Structure 1
Amino acid sequence: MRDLKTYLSVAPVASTLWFAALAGLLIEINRFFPDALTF
C-alpha cells in the first residue's frame, strides 16, 4: 500500500493525474464560459 502510494507518485503517474485534473478544469470553464476572447 505504501509501495503503491510510492508508485502513484512516480513522475509519469503524478503527471497524468495532474494534467487530467487540469484538463477537466479547463474543459468545464470552457463549457460554463465558452468563446471567451476578451479576458
Structure 2
Amino acid sequence: MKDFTTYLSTAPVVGLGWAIFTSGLLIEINRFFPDPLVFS
C-alpha cells in the first residue's frame, strides 16, 4: 500500500485529479448561475 500511494503521488495521476477538480468546478460554475459575462 505504501507503494500504491506512491504511484498515486506520481505526476500523470496527481494531474488527473487536478484536472477533474478544475474542469468539474468550472463546468459546475457554468451549469449554475448560467453563462456569466459582466460580474454584477
- Aligned match of 2:6: 6
Residues paired across the two proteins, number = 39
TM-score when scaled to structure 2?
A: 0.84
Letter of the 1:28 partner, please give it.
Answer: E
Percent of matched pairs sharing the same residue? 62
TM-score when scaled to structure 1?
A: 0.85
Deviation per CA, 1:18-38: give whole Å up to 9, x if none: 111111111111100111011
Tell me which protein shows more helix as a share of its residues.
Answer: 1
User: 5+ residue gaps in structure 2?
Assistant: none
User: 5+ residue gaps in structure 1?
Assistant: none
**CA RMSD after TM alignment:** 0.8
